[PDB]
Amino acid sequence: AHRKLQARLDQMRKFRRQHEQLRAVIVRVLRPQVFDAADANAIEEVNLAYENVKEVDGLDVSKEGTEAWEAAMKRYDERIDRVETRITARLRDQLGTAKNANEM
Amino acid sequence: VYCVNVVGTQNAHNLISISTDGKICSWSLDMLSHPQDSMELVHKQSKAVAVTSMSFPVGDVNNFVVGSEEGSVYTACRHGSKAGISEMFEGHQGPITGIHCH
Numbered sequence: 001a002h003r004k005l006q007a008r009l010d011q012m013r014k015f016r017r018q019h020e021q022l023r024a025v026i027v028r029v030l031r032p033q034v035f036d037a038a039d040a041n042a043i044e045e046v047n048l049a050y051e052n053v054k055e056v057d058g059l060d061v062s063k064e065g066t067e068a069w070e071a072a073m074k075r076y077d078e079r080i081d082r083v084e085t086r087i088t089a090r091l092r093d094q095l096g097t098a099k100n101a102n103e104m
Numbered sequence: 105v106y107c108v109n110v111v112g113t114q115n116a117h118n119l120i121s122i123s124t125d126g127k128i129c130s131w132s133l134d135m136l137s138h139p140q141d142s143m144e145l146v147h148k149q150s151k152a153v154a155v156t157s158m159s160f161p162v163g164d165v166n167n168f169v170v171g172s173e174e175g176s177v178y179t180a181c182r183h184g185s186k187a188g189i190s191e192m193f194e195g196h197q198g199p200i201t202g203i204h205c206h
Contacts, residue, residue: 092115092117
């Protein structure tokens with residue numbers, strides 16, 4: 001009976017693990033060396049996706065809040081996949097700016 | 105190899121080739137001497153799928169979709185934590201001969 005809640009707690013802890021290990025160092029990554037609109041757009045997409053998961057209760061072990069959590073993480077997955085394809089376009093722009101090793 | 109295609113931008117791009125057994129390989133055009141990123145598309149306790157057909161979405165370099173000899177449409181993402189086969193479609197009672205995104 002307790003094994004259903006423990007897996008959902010594992011899901012929320014691993015969710016906060018991947019979200020914090022993105023979040024706390026993606027500010028350092030999108031810091032300009034001393035500003036764009038796309039960087040603060042990607043940060044606020046991470047914040048909006050975090051609210052798009054965190055309005056859904058993590059404590060609903062029953063099926064409806066479980067699939068509401070599924071819709072929340074699917075919306076999260078699509079949103080940071082959209083941000084990830086934008087930075088993947090910036091990765092193609094990384095050899096789009098460069099040819100030699102030092103600037104890479 | 106029934107399918108081979110190219111995406112990426114003008115300033116950086118990749119050659120994408122899927123074979124009958126389901127092995128994908130990334131290639132350069134300047135160098136074909138070794139594949140770059142190469143792995144195997146599997147699903148269903150890792151059975152080797154039998155990929156026939158190929159479609160890219162327009163504007164997508166990471167996600168894509170295959171058809172198969174097994175009556176099965178699979179979308180699949182290129183890289184990341186869900187590098188490999190995403191999922192599965194059903195409905196066809198024949199081997200799939202051609203797919204195309206809008």
